[PDB]
Amino acid sequence: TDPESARGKLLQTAAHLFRNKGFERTTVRDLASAVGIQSGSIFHHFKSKDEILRAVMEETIHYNTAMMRASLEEASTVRERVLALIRCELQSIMGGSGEAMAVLVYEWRSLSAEGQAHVLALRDVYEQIWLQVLGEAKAAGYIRGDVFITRRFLTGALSWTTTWFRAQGSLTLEELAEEALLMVLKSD
Amino acid sequence: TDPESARGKLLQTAAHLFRNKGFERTTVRDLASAVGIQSGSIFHHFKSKDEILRAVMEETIHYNTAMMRASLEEASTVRERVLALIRCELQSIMGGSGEAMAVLVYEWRSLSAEGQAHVLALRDVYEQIWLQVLGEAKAAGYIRGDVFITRRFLTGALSWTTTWFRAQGSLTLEELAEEALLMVLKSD
Ligand SMILES: [Mg+2]
Ligand SMILES: [Mg+2]
């Protein structure tokens, strides 16, 4: 969405308030004061506060995915396409994608069933990009195992990096992504 | 420890009470009634209730590790030794190792710093078995990447299986372990 539209100002500013204070502690008053409007005008753009949270999360995933596809477009070989997705995912895991991603992770349980189903639809599209690229890898002979299960293991291996990557000290994210590629591909 | 010794009866029975009710809700009275003793006699064997929790967790790890080493002893090839550790870890992740493992995972924050350092010492030994076996694999030419980082990714990939393995329906744990082996080894 458009950052200068009042919708965009509201979404982008809500992302910070939610990240800083929590969704539950962020009042409708808080958001209106931050955007320089009155409480009651918030609800000209979203049907509910729950819907603002849904849109913050949708925006983050739309952005991560757009970034992924753009990186893929610049990659012409199997090894570079797999590496592009690994790097994008790691960058998202390590606080790239910013406040609105941190909101997705910690405020997940604040979102309505209906909001959640919308955000999960976007996650489905994100996963299909992974499955396309890993399916290409499998077809070219770079992946030994089942494509869907390979993605499930890689999901866990990359996510877990939050528990240890900072403790390492001298390993960069690019080196981490390269090591992930060495694990998942038979050759690169 | 010895299951028929009063120490063993206490530890093995505490493992259930802690798993069923939580450590915090398990009173000294509860444990004494379950073992058929008086509250005050519990503390002839352990210095504290915190120490009973430490010993439940230590026993589980000692047992998992003993099982690991035994499986390794029956494996004569690199592929079977790596698979043995993957299978043992998965079996532990999926509710093998039983009540005392579930206690380790959920009651971790109830354990004292001193108890924790003891349990972490056992985890160190467990990890060194993984590093030995993966180091053998690397030496024989089966692993492309860094041994320590390969173990960190595999830790995350196996742990994450709790979030999805039941939803699959028809995949067995042995098949899951085989798929993990296909990912981590260049050949098997
Ligand atoms: Mg901003
Ligand atoms: Mg028992």
Residue numbers in the entry:
A (entry chain A), B (entry chain A): 11 to 198
Sentences from the paper on this structure:
A novel enteric T cell superantigen, I2, and its full-length gene product pfiT, are encoded by a microbial gene associated with Crohn's disease (CD). Crystal structure of pfiT at high resolution revealed that pfiT belongs to the bacterial transcription factor family of tetracycline repressor (TetR). We show that pfiT specifically and directly interacts with class II MHC HLA-DR, and to a lesser extent HLA-DP or HLA-DQ, and show that pfiT shares an overlapping binding site on HLA-DR1 with other superantigens. We show that pfiT can stimulate the activation of both mouse splenocytes and human peripheral blood mononuclear cells (PBMCs).
